[PDB]
Each structure stands twice: as structure tokens, then as C-alpha cells.
Design a protein around this ligand. Sequence first.
Ligand SMILES: CN(C)C[C@H]1CC[C@H](N2C(=O)N(C)Cc3cnc4ccc(-c5cc(Cl)c(O)c(Cl)c5)nc4c32)CC1
Length: 321
Amino acid sequence: GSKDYDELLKYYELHETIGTGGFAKVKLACHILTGEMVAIKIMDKNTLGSDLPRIKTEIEALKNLRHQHICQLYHVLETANKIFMVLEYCPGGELFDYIISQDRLSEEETRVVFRQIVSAVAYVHSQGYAHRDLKPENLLFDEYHKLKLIDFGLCAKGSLAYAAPELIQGKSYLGSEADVWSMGILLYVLMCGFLPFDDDNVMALYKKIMRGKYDVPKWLSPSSILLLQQMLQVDPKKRISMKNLLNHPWIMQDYNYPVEWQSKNPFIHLDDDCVTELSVHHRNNRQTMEDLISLWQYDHLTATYLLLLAKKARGKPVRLR
Ligand SMILES: CN(C)C[C@H]1CC[C@H](N2C(=O)N(C)Cc3cnc4ccc(-c5cc(Cl)c(O)c(Cl)c5)nc4c32)CC1
């Protein structure tokens, strides 16, 4: 409805549609006070019913996962009929596009990308979650060519070609072991440009996945081949631990330090220039304003603070309209 938007258009001006998923439309928009571009995920609550609790788990998860390689949530706005999620804009497109335009990535370009994936998924597990839909369509590049993991609608506590054998059998599974399998599929796709398990017929592809045999192209280094085998194990108990992936020898090559998985931001002190400019727009003193930001309700103040922070990092004036 029109009233479903009046709160949102107080804070954002809508631009074009940039994407449409199952239950959601994603619009490019401009945060009015900072001028920063953002993506707004729009969902209609009536249209969704059974995955309405899915969205609440996605939102709860995104508020608990602040990380340099996880698409950052700025603002949650719920109305009578709508739920709006204001998110970090990723103009660089999907990892899918990068791969398909390059045909395939060299081992070096793969590891540049893969270390960022490992970074994000290890942090997700450290917070008690599992993604469960890891795939190149759910990994976007921002404008600095940094990867951002998206779509926690299927997160725990999927796309068939990336699903672990035990999920295809309808069996019990651990979320982290399923993420490691999917990351093994991702690493194959990065370096080959095609899937290790594929078939036009779904039952035939069920059987290929559970068997676990895949072609090994001649351009794969021996080291790449072994890491592929340690992640793509049909028995989830024999798949490499996330802990052992962080400083795996193939991961370390050309870097010599393990994957930094810890969040770079945490919940440190607030940036002084940001809270000062905020307080100049809010009829409150600085301490009161600092207290309000620390509640992190993902209202408009959370969004203004985080985007004024991003705009400061951009080298632009620390100013609001
Ligand atoms: C088709 N899929 C099921 C979803 C599709 C939605 C559009 C999206 N996109 C695009 O397609 N561009 C072309 C640009 C683009 C730019 N910035 C974005 C910023 C955030 C997100 C985003 C989307 C969703 Cl559904 C999320 O849950 C989260 Cl946490 C984040 N998507 C973006 C996005 C790509 C994936």
C-alpha cells in the first residue's frame, strides 16, 4: 500500500529495480541524509506466510553477522504489509558473472576469491550459524572488488548442484559440514567454469552427487586437486574441518598467513566525527546520541550512522543533508 512506503520515502529515494528473487524485490535507492546508495530488499508479508518466519531468521541472523565479507544490514523497517531491509550496495555484480565472463579463474585469482569466502563462512560458523545455500549467485562484489555473502533465508540456527549428499538423501546433517561441501563445489567452479556434478535429469544428478565422482581437468595443479578431495567427501565426517581450511597449505600459498576470519569492525567505540554530526541533526546532546546509537535497533539512526561511517571512509565530507 501507499502507507507502507511513507516511512521509507522519508529516508530513501527509490531508483530502479535491480533484481527479483522468489519472495523479494531488490531496489537501488539513495539514503537521503548522506547521499549514499543502498540496496533495499522489499517483501510483502501476506505473499509469504510459511517463509515469514524464514525472513525473521534471516533478519535476526544479519543483525548478528557484522563482517567485512557479509552484506551489511543497515535498516529494518516493517509496516502493516511490508518488510524493508536496507543493505550494503554491491555494484560489482554476482560471482557467477565474474566466473562466466572469464570462462574460469586461474588458481591465483581463485584463491583471492576463495580466501574471502572462507573468511565469511568461518565467521558465520563462529557465531553459531550455517549458511546452507553457498553458491556464486549468493556472493557479490562491491565497488572495491571485495566479496559479500548474501541471502541468509536458508540459514540454520538449497540449490541442488551445491547441496551435500546427505541433504539429497533427506538425512540428518550438520550445517557446517554442508557448508564445507558447497564450498568445495564453489572451488571447483571457480577453477573450471562448470559444475563437478551436473545433469539435465534431476534423478541422474542425485546419483552423481551421492556417488561423488567428478572429472579432474588437466589444468588443475596437484595441490588444487587434493584440497578438492578433502572438501568433496561424500561422508561428512571425513570432510576437512573449517579450522584446518583456515591455514591449509593451498590456502597459504602466495600469502603465508592464515585466512583472517574475525570481523574487522566489532562493537568498538563509535567514530567521534560521525556521532558529532549526527547529534547536530537530532535535538539531543552527544551522550544521549551516543547512547541511542549503541542500542543498534536497525532503525533509521543505525542506518544514518553506518552510512555516515561508510561515507567518511570514502574520503567525502562527514555531513548530513
Ligand atoms: C535472485 N536472488 C535470489 C537474489 C538476488 C537479488 C538481487 C541481487 N543484486 C543484483 O542482482 N544486482 C544486479 C545488483 C545488486 C547490488 N547490490 C545488492 C545488495 C544486496 C543484495 C542482497 C539481496 C538479497 Cl535477496 C539478500 O538476501 C541480501 Cl542479504 C542482499 N543484492 C544486491 C544486488 C542479487 C541476488
